[PDB]
Design an enzyme around this catalytic site. Structure first.
Site, PDB file in Angstrom:
ATOM      1  N   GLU A  35       0.778  -1.230  -0.172  1.00 47.32           N
ATOM      2  CA  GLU A  35      -0.003  -0.008  -0.132  1.00 47.32           C
ATOM      3  C   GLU A  35       0.903   1.333   0.167  1.00 47.32           C
ATOM      4  O   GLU A  35       0.532   2.395  -0.801  1.00 47.32           O
ATOM      5  CB  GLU A  35      -0.811  -0.140   1.128  1.00 47.32           C
ATOM      6  CG  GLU A  35      -1.939  -1.021   1.079  1.00 47.32           C
ATOM      7  CD  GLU A  35      -3.174  -0.710  -0.016  1.00 47.32           C
ATOM      8  OE1 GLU A  35      -3.110   0.367  -0.497  1.00 47.32           O
ATOM      9  OE2 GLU A  35      -3.899  -1.714  -0.342  1.00 47.32           O
ATOM     10  N   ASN A  46      -7.707   9.197  -5.716  1.00 46.48           N
ATOM     11  CA  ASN A  46      -8.544   8.030  -6.475  1.00 46.48           C
ATOM     12  C   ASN A  46      -9.468   8.552  -7.491  1.00 46.48           C
ATOM     13  O   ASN A  46      -9.777  10.005  -7.278  1.00 46.48           O
ATOM     14  CB  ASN A  46      -9.421   7.164  -5.520  1.00 46.48           C
ATOM     15  CG  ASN A  46      -8.707   6.783  -4.339  1.00 46.48           C
ATOM     16  OD1 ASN A  46      -7.929   5.945  -4.656  1.00 46.48           O
ATOM     17  ND2 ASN A  46      -9.217   6.766  -3.206  1.00 46.48           N
ATOM     18  N   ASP A  48     -12.493   8.542  -8.116  1.00 51.43           N
ATOM     19  CA  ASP A  48     -13.761   9.288  -7.760  1.00 51.43           C
ATOM     20  C   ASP A  48     -13.406  10.555  -6.776  1.00 51.43           C
ATOM     21  O   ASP A  48     -14.283  11.379  -6.434  1.00 51.43           O
ATOM     22  CB  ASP A  48     -14.697   8.520  -6.811  1.00 51.43           C
ATOM     23  CG  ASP A  48     -13.934   7.963  -5.443  1.00 51.43           C
ATOM     24  OD1 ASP A  48     -12.683   8.679  -5.054  1.00 51.43           O
ATOM     25  OD2 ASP A  48     -14.610   7.442  -4.556  1.00 51.43           O
ATOM     26  N   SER A  50     -11.837  10.809  -4.189  1.00 49.24           N
ATOM     27  CA  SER A  50     -11.429  10.591  -2.833  1.00 49.24           C
ATOM     28  C   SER A  50      -9.826  10.442  -2.729  1.00 49.24           C
ATOM     29  O   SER A  50      -9.154  10.282  -3.773  1.00 49.24           O
ATOM     30  CB  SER A  50     -12.189   9.328  -2.211  1.00 49.24           C
ATOM     31  OG  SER A  50     -11.674   8.206  -2.950  1.00 49.24           O
ATOM     32  N   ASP A  52      -6.361   8.330  -0.529  1.00 45.23           N
ATOM     33  CA  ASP A  52      -5.707   7.432   0.290  1.00 45.23           C
ATOM     34  C   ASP A  52      -4.520   8.019   1.214  1.00 45.23           C
ATOM     35  O   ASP A  52      -3.671   8.522   0.487  1.00 45.23           O
ATOM     36  CB  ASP A  52      -5.418   6.066  -0.378  1.00 45.23           C
ATOM     37  CG  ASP A  52      -6.714   5.319  -1.066  1.00 45.23           C
ATOM     38  OD1 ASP A  52      -7.721   5.766  -0.690  1.00 45.23           O
ATOM     39  OD2 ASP A  52      -6.252   4.474  -1.790  1.00 45.23           O
ATOM     40  N   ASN A  59      -8.949   5.404   3.033  1.00 43.62           N
ATOM     41  CA  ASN A  59      -9.689   6.183   2.108  1.00 43.62           C
ATOM     42  C   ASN A  59     -10.657   7.427   2.664  1.00 43.62           C
ATOM     43  O   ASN A  59     -11.346   6.726   3.538  1.00 43.62           O
ATOM     44  CB  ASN A  59     -10.666   5.194   1.048  1.00 43.62           C
ATOM     45  CG  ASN A  59     -11.292   5.852  -0.068  1.00 43.62           C
ATOM     46  OD1 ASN A  59     -11.186   7.089  -0.313  1.00 43.62           O
ATOM     47  ND2 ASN A  59     -11.705   4.861  -0.939  1.00 43.62           N
TER      48      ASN A  59
END
Ligand SMILES: [Cl-]
Ligand SMILES: [Cl-]
Ligand code: NA
Length: 129
Positions: A35, A46, A48, A50, A52, A59
């Site tokens: 990650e 991301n 959309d 959002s 992380d 998220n």
């Protein structure tokens, strides 16, 4: 902060992640590796809109507030910036809520695709825990 592999294993163990909801420590270390490459300051945006955050790439759509993810939840009740601290407490406590929500560690795409079904104990081999 960029953790060493055994340093992070030790910190996660102290914070109660070893076998939390049945996931051995190697699972959590493997997920952190893919990650964030063990970097608490990792961020990724991301599609959309959002973002992380942190060592476990939590998220902002569901788990933390970053002030720029409209209509998002803040289910860990924390600013997303708290997830970037060299102190992993906030990331660990939030991850415990995530992994308990029904889907286990499948919530972390990199765990599903790169750790699940592999010899995850190898991620803690050699560490004094
Ligand atoms: Cl393990
Ligand atoms: Cl992946
Ligand atoms: Na820590």
């Amino acid at each position: 902060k960029v953790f060493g592999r055994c340093e992070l294993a030790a910190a996660m163990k102290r914070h109660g992640l070893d076998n939390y909801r049945g996931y051995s420590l190697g699972n959590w270390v493997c997920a952190a590796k893919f990650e964030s490459n063990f970097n608490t300051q990792a961020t990724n945006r991301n599609t959309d809109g959002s973002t992380d955050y942190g060592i476990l790439q939590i998220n902002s759509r569901w788990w933390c507030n970053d002030g720029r993810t409209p209509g998002s939840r803040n289910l860990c009740n924390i600013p997303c910036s708290a997830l970037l601290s060299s102190d992993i407490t906030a990331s660990v406590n939030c991850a415990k809520k995530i992994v308990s929500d029904g889907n286990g560690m499948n919530a972390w795409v990199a765990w599903r695709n790169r750790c699940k079904g592999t010899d995850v104990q190898a991620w803690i081999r050699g560490c004094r825990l």
